[model samples]
Target: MVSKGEELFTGVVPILVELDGDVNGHKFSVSGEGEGDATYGKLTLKFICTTGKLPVPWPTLVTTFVQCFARYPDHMRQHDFFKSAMPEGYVQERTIFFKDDGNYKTRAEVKFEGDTLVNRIELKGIDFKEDGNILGHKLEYNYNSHNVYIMADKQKNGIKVNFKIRHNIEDGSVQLADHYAQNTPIGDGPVLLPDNHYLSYQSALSKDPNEKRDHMVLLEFVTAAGITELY
Candidate 1:
């Protein structure tokens, strides 16, 4: 049912909504990685509609998503990591969604942390998405580790994405490479599009109505040029 790294949760879900005049249908996927203690040190969710149009705008779409999972219907109330019934502490929540301005806007809220750097995250900027990079800035993260350093670079795609965080066993990294490319493009596995912190799974597109390929990414932080400066 679940593997070691997979218990944190990694899979795709399809969405279908037909309102008065709007047809809300798309594929959304969520992938998460946590510390050994089962804390959601890293979690990522993505929703995409390639062919048709979305029912709501970007911000509203995300709000709708939160409404479904975080609030009403009690959908994720039983989940291990996202239980609204039991609010935990020392956690920070941040959500970022795309916009028409070609910028990925973000919002942050503090949960409760005493210090001792328990979470770390990395993200790629627009420059890499424009030029092409194998890994840098795409996304990476870790927590409670003493030594962890990682760097991934490609020749034609752009610059390599690389970083290093040392000292412990807790670590994770992710990259969203071009799925249409003939080559693997990214560093490893299954030939999937988004590398969820080295945990890759395939969610192919379908021809059925309201059925589409899943857009999944395990994002930890946002940054420009893959630098440590993340927001």
Candidate 2:
């Protein structure tokens, strides 16, 4: 289910990510908007995580998404108005699983078009896993009127990728028989913590001193366990 914060500012908001892809390191961005003016706003959501080799992968990736929102609820929710602006999905369900034991990170972008409504959703990003390092990846989830698109491109590699849109529907609860719908839940979510673990002078030196720093030192962190309990 959508969080209360996500339910507030529904509009064309950008989701950005900074990380290392298989080919190289780059910054990624995703944009999403609500269906109407009252429901939408000029807010953006950005996320960043490290890729390539690391001591741990799953916790790192999952924690990033969860914490990104947890820490920036107001900022993130400010741009997530679509959660309440549009009609909630017909079905509601949730999924809980451990992170893949692999060497890859992924960035996602979602766009919500009010004019087209259901089939206008789009997603794009890269995945670096043991299976193989796929570049310029794309896919579409077009279940009936509710169509979703996925696309990806490697900036440094200069390759573009796109995929077909697929769809499935089911009752409030997902069933194998249903092929066009999935489930989402409704409930209170968990809190997210800050992403930066080290606030040393060296890290500060590496950072652009001129860049606007978040004056608020509170750490924004989120727990993956929320999906486990709510779903």
Candidate 3:
């Protein structure tokens, strides 16, 4: 059994990743409400730069988040609260949860692919929910036009898998803003001004020939996930 401190640490520490494919140099931190075992809670994961300004159209940040959640070992699978609360269609097509032994494991295989992207996720060992058991349930989700693609699956279970494209150029900035500003930059915040328009510091600097600046952008997500009656 993981102590409460361990659970809190797992949720708060940002999981960082290098802009390159190497995981050793990348690091991140996650923090939020409700530690250990709880029915409903919110958490934010932040990615910081240890080297060069994180790549533009920062797909590396998205990939890092996905990889961090994907690395939740097989032992921690049975934590009903943890299993059902992960971002929908994330971790590829696989649904991961905790097992009887308190280890995390995959419960199902979610195969997601697109013309430009292909991925396969498999749940290794998971059992069905028992009667009267509480499971984590997703309430609702809205996709950011930049980082995700939501498409209907006609062949399988009619469920949709959210897809991320690494090279999309147009919406990447908006997606990056949403990721760091928690979907409010386009609407309001320090990044927002009185005219209801969002501006990018990086873009401003790019336009000025005399100014050379290194800018780092961070994305924030406001999420609520908790355990509930399985009924």
Candidate 4:
């Protein structure tokens, strides 16, 4: 069932991916209002950077003004922060919501290529894969386009995720008024932007590999785009 927000106001939204299994037959599901082509709703697909935890309300970032809805409680809506609504018993969360024609089909794919963790991503023929030196990397709303990156080298390399509102360059459809650069020296490039798009990517990693721990990450790439693949 599509909410009034989805049917009346309509815009880019969140995809809620969850792991429900307190030994009571748990499963995860992604819901929406349209068909294979014009799909949108409590959409969720998990396998990496963008994921979440909750049972109550999860709002839609449809426009900043007409914002969201909830899946768990159904009545509680309007969230101002990600951590504020995260439910108990879970560890992560991420999103999307909508209906339109821009052929908004987002492709989120990742695989293990011999000690290397990656989500084979390329935009407009340009390779967005992490550098060979960097063992792994992913994006969520793909901040700056390089916010989430990993260097499997237990100590010598590094990867970090910073949440910001940069250029939404995944498809070049969502334009901005002001343009700027983060590193005008490396000749300059994009920064990770999370507030306006529905892009969530992640990879399993050892947060403290030197000591051994932390195994999952969920990043998102948000926009009016409907995610078609995530793994």
- Most accurate candidate by TM-score: 3
Regions of candidate 2 where Cα sits further than 4 Å from its true position:
1-7, 10-43, 50-131, 135-183, 188-231
Clash count, predicted structure 2: 34
Give the alpha carbon lDDT tens digit for every residue of 97-178 in model 4: 1212111112222222232222222111112122211112111132233122111111211111123223233345432212
Per-residue CA lDDT of model 2 for 1-231, tens digit only, reads 556435432443333333332322333322222222223222122222222222222122221221112122342332221242233211111121212212222332222333222211111222334232122111111111111111111222111222121112222321111111111212222222222221110000022245343110112222111110436
Where does the lowest 10-residue lDDT sum fall in candidate 2?
Answer: 196-205
- Candidate 3 stretches with Cα past 4 Å from truth are 1-19, 22-50, 53-56, 66-168, 171-215, 222-231
Preferred candidate (TM-score higher): 1 or 2 = 2
Instruction: List residue ranges in candidate 4 displaced over 4 A.
Output: 1-131, 136-214, 217-231
Cα shift from native, residue 159, model 3 (Å): 17
TM-score for each model: 0.19, 0.21, 0.26, 0.16
| lDDT tens per residue, model 1, 102-195 | 2222221211133111221211113222321211122222222111111222333211212222211113432212111111122222111211
Q: How big is the positional error of residue 221 in model 1, measured in Å on the Cα after superposition?
A: 18
Candidate whose lDDT is highest: 3
Ranking according to lDDT, highest score first: 3, 2, 1, 4
**Model 1 lDDT on a 0 to 1 scale:** 0.22
Position 182, candidate 4: lDDT? 16
lDDT (CA) per prediction? 0.22, 0.23, 0.24, 0.21
How far does residue 215 in candidate 4 sit from its true spot (Å)?
2.4
lDDT of 3 by residue, 9-39 (tens): 2433333222222122222222111111121
